[PDB]
Enzyme design. Sequence first.
Site, PDB file in Angstrom:
ATOM      1  CG  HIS A   1     -13.131  -9.307 -12.884  1.00 23.65           C
ATOM      2  ND1 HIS A   1     -13.026  -9.921 -11.831  1.00 23.65           N
ATOM      3  CD2 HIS A   1     -12.397  -8.145 -12.669  1.00 23.65           C
ATOM      4  CE1 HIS A   1     -12.232  -9.416 -10.986  1.00 23.65           C
ATOM      5  NE2 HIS A   1     -11.748  -8.380 -11.533  1.00 23.65           N
TER       6      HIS A   1
ATOM      7  CD  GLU B   1      -2.865  -0.908   0.039  1.00 23.73           C
ATOM      8  OE1 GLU B   1      -2.868   0.212  -0.617  1.00 23.73           O
ATOM      9  OE2 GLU B   1      -3.231  -1.890  -0.757  1.00 23.73           O
TER      10      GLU B   1
END
Lengths: 195, 582
Positions: free
Chosen positions: B475, B345
């Site tokens: 997706h 991150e």
Amino acid sequence: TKLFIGQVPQPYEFGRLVFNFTKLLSYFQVNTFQCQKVTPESISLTVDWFAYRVEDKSDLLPGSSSDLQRFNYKPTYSNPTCLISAYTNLVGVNPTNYTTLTNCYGCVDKDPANPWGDQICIPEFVTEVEPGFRPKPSCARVGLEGHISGNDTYSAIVTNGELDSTGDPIWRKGVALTKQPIDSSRADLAFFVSV
Amino acid sequence: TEDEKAKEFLEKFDLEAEKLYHQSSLASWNYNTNITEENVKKMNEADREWSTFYENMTKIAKNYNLSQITDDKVKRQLQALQQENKRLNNILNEMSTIYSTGKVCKPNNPQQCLLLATGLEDIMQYSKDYDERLWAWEGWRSQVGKQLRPLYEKYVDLKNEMAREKNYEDYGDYWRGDYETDGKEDYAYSRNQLIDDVERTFEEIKPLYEHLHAYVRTKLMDAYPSRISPTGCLPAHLLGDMWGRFWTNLYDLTVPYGEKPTIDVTAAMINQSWDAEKIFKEAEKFFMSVGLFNMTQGFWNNSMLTKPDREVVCHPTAWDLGNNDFRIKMCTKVTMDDFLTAHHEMGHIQYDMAYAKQPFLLRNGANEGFHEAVGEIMSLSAATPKHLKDLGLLAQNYPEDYETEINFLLKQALNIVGTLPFTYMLEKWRWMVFKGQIPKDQWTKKWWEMKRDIVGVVEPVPHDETYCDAASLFHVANDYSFIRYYTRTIFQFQFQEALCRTAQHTGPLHKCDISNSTAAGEKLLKMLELGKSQPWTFALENIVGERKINVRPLLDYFRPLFNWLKEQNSNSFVGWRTDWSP
Ligand SMILES: *[C@@H]1O[C@H](CO)[C@@H](O[C@@H]2O[C@H](CO)[C@@H](O[C@@H]3O[C@H](CO)[C@@H](O)[C@H](O)[C@@H]3O)[C@H](O)[C@H]2NC(C)=O)[C@H](O)[C@H]1NC(C)=O
Ligand SMILES: *[C@@H]1O[C@H](CO)[C@@H](O[C@@H]2O[C@H](CO)[C@@H](O)[C@H](O)[C@H]2NC(C)=O)[C@H](O)[C@H]1NC(C)=O
Ligand SMILES: *[C@@H]1O[C@H](CO)[C@@H](O)[C@H](O)[C@H]1NC(C)=O
Ligand SMILES: *[C@@H]1O[C@H](CO)[C@@H](O)[C@H](O)[C@H]1NC(C)=O
Ligand SMILES: *[C@@H]1O[C@H](CO)[C@@H](O)[C@H](O)[C@H]1NC(C)=O
Ligand SMILES: *[C@@H]1O[C@H](CO)[C@@H](O)[C@H](O)[C@H]1NC(C)=O
Ligand SMILES: *[C@@H]1O[C@H](CO)[C@@H](O)[C@H](O)[C@H]1NC(C)=O
Ligand SMILES: *[C@@H]1O[C@H](CO)[C@@H](O)[C@H](O)[C@H]1NC(C)=O
Ligand SMILES: *[C@@H]1O[C@H](CO)[C@@H](O)[C@H](O)[C@H]1NC(C)=O
């Protein structure tokens, strides 16, 4: 003079002892004398020494990429250090031939149920000498066998007293190459002298 | 003269755009780290204002004649803006809903039904019962997949009409435009070039996959006696996943040396009294040692590195609020996964800071796979035995072990290699559907033929053209592109090799740490700073050394495993036949 008494060790089993330079130069004929972080005129002290040919001297020099400094002996030289490459007749005893490790890499067991059985060896698991230390004993033993087998390039899978994280033997595949001397009546020695 | 108009337009755009972006992003942050009725309202109205602004200035940008713009950066900024709707929105909303609320009911009690995230995923992950696994697998596709058929068919037709209005051949062609760039000589990249490169690299992976496939096959044959043929395809429901996207969950069945545990420093961090603040501080010095940015005072103030004791979203994310305001939102625990995640991150933040000097519209990654690939490579370095040792978490004299290296590499391969044929096949199928290469009434037929030929997986149950397996995945049902995962993986390894080369690392690539390497940091930063101002091929060259897509680094990373697998398969069939089915 003790280092000139008896036989001369191979690069993978280099000798080390700890304690007049002019007197030493009266024992052997020096070809190359170079120093790193120290003036040669100035050179507790320690010496790492082994048999090594003059013709392939290049391998002894700092910064060089070679098998010698990868699998056999690498000088960290954190202390000021000098390299002396010389030839001499010890008659100690002169080397019959020169053996160098050219490779060594780790192996895993084919069958998990038997740590002492057939091994799968992986070329990518390269085991290289740490500066100042001797090669691992599963690497050095191949060199010792290669020095006597007769094959000019011996290969073998061995283990020699070193254990893994569980207590099972560590196996490594080593390759040793034996070079014949040009001058059969002299010893070629390398000396690494550190303060 | 229009070059000058375009410039004053963009200047005015940036001044308003940054103000509206910042307030919109702040409202979103406040919601995610509090969650109230008041906060969701503020978020919604803030998003509205930005949206109307952006659309109004899109219409203006489209009144410019792009072909007479001299300054390339102005040209790219204009492009950022410049580049049946009611019916399509209804189809898209219904498809998403059907997926989200999908459930599978038990055959002996219709009143008791499991939802994907409440039980079905746990069956596919933990169950070792052939018939229980099959129930969940077939149930999901029967109950959900068969509802999305008529919607996916309408979806495809409507999407192609849209793409063609915009002068694309089809919607697949539209999607591939995300890799299209201009440039001198061979820096330019065509939409149809992606296809050639994807197929080209795939063919170089096959040998690695066939050996991995054969190894897994022999392990599953023991787990499920007389269910699997030694020369055939693997049953879809036995892969530890609802779709077979990853083989990660098979590790417990395939682990080469089960007596050789991997490194885990959870206990070390607990004994040494680590916390979230310590974890992020250690991550920060990692980035400083390689030669990148340190964290600002705002980062250390307005971030949420711990779960409050509010209602919050604990999913780890990196935020760029605007006006030099960077934050991380992550409910950090002291484990090992969160330790490595902190590096992932923060890697995103490093990239976001690097191009903070770019024009507003160019403040993004050079390519859709670049931003994530950067995160992954920083995470891998921090996971090495020597890094853990130097941190004081792993014993200084920790014994060496080669079997644990094989265990590590396989685990990585199950997640990284075993997924590539899935991404390749899935996206290829959709591309053929959009083009019209696959007839409307041969969708199911081709799905399973391609899957058996490319991936080596076979349907446990005969299916006809009433099913839609593609749309049973998140997706596909939710209108997302998938190829980004394929290219990300390849770039990830190209970046890592180049940096480990710059750092002068000699040894296995899987044991590389770029710490204390300013040279690797400088080389990485040069690429990060570009944002979207340059072609991704240019940005790629600056970090890799070449401007082309290259899978070789991936194959080198896993080479030690490939050699091991080859010998393990000495007495096994490698590859598969498609004439067999259960
Ligand atoms: C390098 O020099 C060493 C000696 O310093 C050479 O080692 C000698 O090699 C011969 C030939 O293999 C050995 O003789 C053989 O011994 C075995 C028993 O182990 C016997 O079965 C054979 O019939 C034969 O007699 C000799 O013993 C060995 N010397 C020592 C001290 O072990 C080595 O071969 C040379 N390497 C090269 C490439 O020339
Ligand atoms: C979470 O949101 C609530 C609003 O629903 C915030 O409560 C308000 O706080 C302000 C002070 O900043 C007061 O003036 C308001 O009267 C409060 N409203 C209500 C309904 O209580 C709360 O402070 C927020 N929490 C955080 C950490 O931001
Ligand atoms: C000795 O040399 C022969 C010929 O190259 C080779 O086949 C054999 O494997 C070698 N043995 C060892 C121990 O290297
Ligand atoms: C769009 O921008 C123009 C700028 O000239 C402005 O005059 C117009 O009112 C704006 N329209 C809306 C809906 O904001
Ligand atoms: C303006 O746009 C048209 C296309 O609609 C193009 O043909 C023309 O060449 C452009 N004008 C200039 C000066 O490039
Ligand atoms: C760490 O482990 C030792 C045992 O080796 C124990 O005595 C000590 O209390 C532990 N410290 C913490 C914080 O758990
Ligand atoms: C970290 O960044 C701040 C920016 O204000 C700077 O003052 C500080 O000296 C930096 N520390 C290091 C080690 O670079
Ligand atoms: C961060 O919080 C401290 C509270 O001790 C405050 O003094 C400081 O000004 C704040 N800095 C920023 C950038 O908000
Ligand atoms: C980098 O070097 C420092 C000492 O300068 C050391 O503390 C740190 O652990 C090193 N990081 C590595 C090698 O991961």
